[PDB]
Every structure is written in structure tokens, then in C-alpha cells.
Amino acid sequence: GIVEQCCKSICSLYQLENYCN
Amino acid sequence: GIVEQCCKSICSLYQLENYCN
Amino acid sequence: GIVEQCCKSICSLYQLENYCN
Amino acid sequence: FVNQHLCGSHLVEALYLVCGERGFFYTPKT
Amino acid sequence: FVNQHLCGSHLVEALYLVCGERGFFYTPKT
Amino acid sequence: FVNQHLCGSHLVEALYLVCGERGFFYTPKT
Ligand SMILES: [Zn+2]
Q: List the disulfide bonds (chains A, B, C).
């Protein structure tokens, strides 16, 4: 999930937008 | 105090409510 | 910068006010 | 409630939500 | 966007800004 | 003022309170 990508690693603006609706 | 219970360890909803008035 | 003073070390009220305008 | 360690201003904001109209006391000393 | 590790309530607040009127889902499980 | 290490968005929010109507500059580079 998001806690492995954006918290355990770093997320750019786009890798975070995949978690929008 | 609260910094030994809820920060150095984890606090549930009730162990945190003991710090209300 | 500020990330070496106030984040890597601790900043008092005055060492932080030097970053105002 | 969340199963994480609550610290700093997040701990104070947890206390704000959890008590509401009762209010709280934050005394961080050892 | 910022080059830091985004966690806790900061990660949820990042998602709030980045999506806006689209909204989001936060499911923190492994 | 608090005796802790101020980082991330908490450092920016510290600067917001401490300056007020003077404003500030946050330039995080080494
Ligand atoms: Zn934080």
C-alpha cells in the first residue's frame, strides 16, 4: 500500500496521485 | 506522565482520556 | 541554513526569529 | 483510535479530539 | 512536490492537497 | 518557546507563529 511507497520510500507527485479517486 | 505512556509506548482511546478534565 | 540549526540541533525563540523578514 | 505512537504536537491534537468540550491538560515533564 | 518521506497525518494531508475535489482513499494495511 | 527539535512542516509552522505579521523565508538547502 501507500505506507510502503510514500512512507518507507519517497513519493513524487504522481505516485501519490494514484491514491486519489 | 503522558510522554512515557502515549509517546514512549502506545495509547488506546481510554489511556488518553485519563488526561482530560 | 535553518535545517542545520533548528532541525539538526535545537532552536530557541531568538535563533528562529533570524529567519523572519 | 489509531495504533501508533503519538508525539509532539500530534499528541496534543489527539487530546484535543478525544476530549472535546471537556478539555485537557498537557504536562510533559519527567 | 517535496522530496521527503511522508508519514502519519502528514501523508494524509499530502493526499488531501494533491487530490482536492477528487478525494482519496487511505488504507494503511500490509 | 519549546525545547524540541523542530522539523518538516512543524518547523514552518513554528516560523509562522514566531514571526506573524513580519512573515518569513524557508530555504531548506545545504
Ligand atoms: Zn509530525
A: 6-11
DSSP class of residue C18 equals T
* Contact by Cβ (8 Å): E6, A11: yes
Q: What is the resolution of this structure in A?
A: 2.5
C5 phi and psi angles, rounded to 5 deg: -90, -55
Q: Which residues of F touch C6 (CB under 8 A)?
A: 5-7, 11, 14
Closest Cα in chain D, distance from residue E8 (Å): 9
Collapsed DSSP state (helix, strand, coil) of residue A13:
helix
HSE on the CB side for E10, CA within 13 Å? Answer: 14
| Residue whose C-alpha is closest to residue C17's, from A7, D8, F23, D30 | F23
What is the rounded CA–CA span in Å between residue F4 and residue F7? 9
Rounded Cα–Cα distance for residues D11 and F10 (Å): 13
Q: According to the entry, how was the structure determined?
A: X-ray
